[PDB]
Design an enzyme around this catalytic site. Structure first.
Site, PDB file in Angstrom:
ATOM      1  N   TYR A 163     -49.254  -0.233  19.416  1.00 22.42           N
ATOM      2  CA  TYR A 163     -49.758   0.712  18.421  1.00 22.42           C
ATOM      3  C   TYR A 163     -49.265   0.323  17.044  1.00 22.42           C
ATOM      4  CZ  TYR A 163     -50.401   5.131  15.879  1.00 22.42           C
ATOM      5  OH  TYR A 163     -50.765   6.086  14.967  1.00 22.42           O
ATOM      6  N   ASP A 180     -45.165  -6.347  12.780  1.00 23.13           N
ATOM      7  CA  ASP A 180     -45.141  -4.905  12.608  1.00 23.13           C
ATOM      8  C   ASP A 180     -43.730  -4.478  12.965  1.00 23.13           C
ATOM      9  OD1 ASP A 180     -45.265  -2.199  12.626  1.00 23.13           O
ATOM     10  OD2 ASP A 180     -47.096  -2.024  13.816  1.00 23.13           O
ATOM     11  N   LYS A 204     -40.738   4.295   9.032  1.00 26.26           N
ATOM     12  CA  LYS A 204     -39.756   4.915   9.865  1.00 26.26           C
ATOM     13  C   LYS A 204     -38.389   4.941   9.163  1.00 26.26           C
ATOM     14  CE  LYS A 204     -42.415   5.369  14.232  1.00 26.26           C
ATOM     15  NZ  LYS A 204     -43.593   4.529  14.336  1.00 26.26           N
TER      16      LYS A 204
HETATM   17  C1  LIG Z   1     -45.076   4.647  14.452  1.00 23.63           C
HETATM   18  C2  LIG Z   1     -45.570   3.236  14.257  1.00 23.63           C
HETATM   19  C3  LIG Z   1     -46.579   2.924  13.341  1.00 23.63           C
HETATM   20  C4  LIG Z   1     -47.276   3.964  12.495  1.00 23.63           C
HETATM   21  O1  LIG Z   1     -46.369   4.514  11.570  1.00 23.63           O
HETATM   22  P1  LIG Z   1     -46.777   5.982  10.945  1.00 23.63           P
HETATM   23  O2  LIG Z   1     -45.797   6.219   9.863  1.00 23.63           O
HETATM   24  O3  LIG Z   1     -46.686   6.998  12.048  1.00 23.63           O
HETATM   25  O4  LIG Z   1     -48.164   5.894  10.460  1.00 23.63           O
HETATM   26  C5  LIG Z   1     -46.949   1.584  13.184  1.00 23.63           C
HETATM   27  N1  LIG Z   1     -46.365   0.574  14.009  1.00 23.63           N
HETATM   28  C6  LIG Z   1     -45.398   0.870  14.932  1.00 23.63           C
HETATM   29  C7  LIG Z   1     -44.786  -0.221  15.805  1.00 23.63           C
HETATM   30  C8  LIG Z   1     -44.987   2.181  15.057  1.00 23.63           C
HETATM   31  O5  LIG Z   1     -44.017   2.505  15.954  1.00 23.63           O
END
Ligand SMILES: *Cc1c(COP(=O)(O)O)cnc(C)c1O
Ligand SMILES: *Cc1c(COP(=O)(O)O)cnc(C)c1O
Ligand SMILES: [Ca+2]
Ligand SMILES: [Ca+2]
Ligand SMILES: [Ca+2]
Ligand SMILES: [Ca+2]
Ligand SMILES: [Ca+2]
Ligand SMILES: [Cl-]
Ligand SMILES: [Cl-]
Lengths: 423, 422
Positions: B145, B234, B262
């Site tokens: 994701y 990511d 995050k």
């Molecule tokens: C949570 C997450 C996202 C999305 O971040 P948001 O601030 O919720 O939009 C993207 N990549 C990874 C690996 C994530 O854990």
């Protein structure tokens, strides 16, 4: 004579850290060819740069600061939440409190979903409209900005060919028409009508400067969409809680299927939202299969700022906005007429913008006839006089509940001097 | 016995206001079949529901809360910024201060651009990769994701293929199994001339914690370099969490672009994308690739992010690894004792327990977890005062404030929860 030494040095540092030295393109002041102003603090309608210069603020962070900087009630609520935890990753009662207020304030909203920005709100509403209708295409207006979702980066106007990095696979599903051109929307429906998921429109266009809808435009969009099974989406990220008490949709009496919100809803914090008819919103995960999520969406800190911001807005706030916008319009009109400057002033509810052209500004094409040399010269002098306007011809002046009559008078007095030096 | 009456009444009201009564799907506790817990406040490693129940928190807002709740320094910095104005729409010195720290902390990042979320960071990095290479296709891994940008909502795994994404978008996303380098090589053999980028989590976190297999990340670097595609990491979850210098520093693999979120916000909405200076130079206003955000780089979020990151030292990670090792040992001890099928994954500081004996190396292997055991275990951990992620497809999050006493109490609680499964 104002000094910008400290801002100049801070921008030298910034340029080695970020693209163009900024976190958002308009902050580089390229449209006015000036050194960017670095801001240190704000209080009410006043903002202070790092060189200690004071300005009357008509930027208000590009719309969010409806009560100006550091509103006491908002500040105290932020401090109280911060001590208890700003984000939990589980439901909170404060999310219920803001959702209830938004539902009551925005006519079309029956069910709402909080996000972190206007870009997140519009991209989510497009996905919801496509999923709900089972259709591919979206229709938007030329010169209008809805955030940076790929589908929306087609003919997005001032600042935005169309951005590279957007594949043909995306571009082919976006239809673009001139804002205020109802007949061309009708013609698009003749070709694509049963594959148009939605029409997305700003009730008052704000990215080509302030351009109100022409008589019959918004009503016409409501008619064409409902007759063809398309949703009508109002992008009220800028208009929401600003043009009127019950938003642009309330002001003009046109009810969309979905509404996107941002800017003021956060009151200075990163908040967006999309909401609308319950049967459409029910298709959003976890109730339905259309996926949207956010880690910081609905965090208590942002819910508190948004709640304290919106609860302080009453119908009387907008009567006062309209009175000040009318005074600014008359003062700018008098200064431009006294100095023989081409000008056109648009006003819609609380919103106001001045274009340096005699052409009636009804669409992006007319807005583009603005004399940008006059805009930049006018802007430079307004800065020298202690007024911080948006550094772009393609933006309106933002008012706050804390602008005083003394601020308005000083602004008009500055505009008279600034107009006197154009020719 | 724990009571949830106030959370039940609050959720009844939430269900008439928001889709599924929540602002993010995971918050509805559907994977565990429980009434969602409404949270009132937290302090350090402790979180409190609206019924007054205390929990040891391993959710930490799903990653952001690396110093736990209401860290004094972060709180004092937020209070001081709020009094002076939270957002200006003009440059600030605090944005320079955080950008400088991030460029120093993250190996691949030479130039950075702040945004408001991980979703904004990944969608922008994909647009930049496509613009920079002049190519349309993106390659991602099954069960991973990256946020809700349309291109990335294909085989996004646990919780997520989403309607509302046209074939016009879907046809430009290639998906292959995580840890499967051969299928990536095959994808490059067939479509290589058209692949703008490979986007990858250095440690998969949406399918539970799944570390990279030997040669996987290096192979991604090699295949991208050789075919003219960018490598995007990511690190929205791994960033500042798996190691001091993130996943890329821990594994010694340098991507072209990195996405952050995050922890970078420390509990406030912040994201970022950064990378090689010549690539980032193509972003507006420096180049023609459009990306903007109204609240991006606002001082409140910059101050929260700065105070969060400045407090993390290499020693923070030595301590995270020590505590994660203690959790792995105690959880393993409890599963063996009660004859429960289990597989524990650990990558740097990150840890996750799967209710399957299969080695969990991809989404297909993670899908062998017994979800009835997970839900029964989870319900008992809540009763014992432990707040874990309400999903089998998430790892446990540690903070710099989880004590040894918190870890021991968590292990004793897991022993009781494991005892009731079989
Ligand atoms: C949570 C997450 C996202 C999305 O971040 P948001 O601030 O919720 O939009 C993207 N990549 C990874 C690996 C994530 O854990
Ligand atoms: C600013 C704006 C957006 C995007 O909002 P962000 O929070 O900057 O992402 C969308 N629509 C309109 C009409 C806007 O003015
Ligand atoms: Ca309503
Ligand atoms: Ca109805
Ligand atoms: Ca989430
Ligand atoms: Ca670096
Ligand atoms: Ca280099
Ligand atoms: Cl036009
Ligand atoms: Cl798989």
């Amino acid at each position: 004579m104002r000094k910008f030494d400290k801002s100049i040095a801070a921008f030298e540092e910034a340029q080695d850290l970020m693209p163009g030295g900024v976190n958002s393109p308009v902050r580089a002041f390229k449209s006015v060819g000036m050194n960017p102003l670095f801001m240190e603090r704000g209080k009410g309608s006043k903002v202070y740069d790092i060189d200690g210069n004071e300005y009357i603020d008509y930027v208000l962070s590009w719309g969010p600061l409806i009560h100006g900087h550091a509103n006491d009630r908002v500040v105290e609520a932020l401090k109280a939440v911060a001590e208890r935890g700003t984000s939990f990753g589980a439901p909170t009662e404060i999310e219920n409190k803001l959702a209830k207020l938004v539902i009551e304030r925005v006519p079309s909203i029956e069910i709402v979903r909080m996000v972190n920005s206007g870009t997140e709100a519009t991209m989510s509403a497009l996905r919801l409209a496509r999923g709900y209708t089972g259709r591919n295409k979206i229709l938007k207006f030329i010169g209008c900005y809805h955030g940076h979702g790929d589908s929306l980066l087609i003919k997005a106007g001032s600042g935005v060919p169309d951005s590279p990095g957007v594949p043909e696979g995306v571009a082919k599903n976006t239809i673009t028409v001139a804002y205020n051109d109802l007949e061309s929307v009708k013609y698009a429906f003749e070709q694509f009508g049963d594959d148009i998921a939605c029409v997305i429109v700003e009730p008052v266009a704000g990215n080509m400067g302030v351009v109100p809808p022409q008589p019959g435009f918004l009503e016409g969009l409501r008619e064409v969409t409902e007759q063809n099974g398309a949703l009508l989406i109002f992008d009220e990220v800028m208009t929401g809680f600003r043009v009127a008490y019950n938003c642009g949709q309330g002001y003009y009496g046109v009810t969309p299927d979905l509404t996107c919100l941002g800017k003021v809803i956060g009151g200075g914090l990163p908040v967006g939202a999309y909401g609308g008819k319950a049967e459409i919103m029910r298709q959003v995960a976890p109730s339905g299969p259309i996926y949207q999520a956010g880690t910081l969406s609905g965090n208590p800190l942002a819910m508190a700022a948004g709640y304290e911001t919106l609860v302080q807005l009453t119908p009387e706030s907008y009567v006062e906005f309209e009175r000040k916008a009318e005074m600014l319009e008359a003062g700018l009109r008098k200064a431009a007429e006294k100095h023989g400057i081409p000008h056109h002033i648009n006003r819609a509810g609380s919103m106001i913008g001045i274009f340096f052209t005699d052409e009636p500004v009804i669409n992006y094409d007319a807005a583009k006839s603005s004399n940008l040399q006059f805009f930049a010269a006018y802007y430079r002098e307004m800065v020298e006089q202690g007024v911080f306007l948006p550094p772009s011809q393609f933006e309106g002046l933002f008012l706050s509940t804390v602008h005083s009559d003394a601020d308005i008078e000083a602004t008009i007095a500055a505009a008279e001097i600034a107009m006197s030096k154009l020719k």
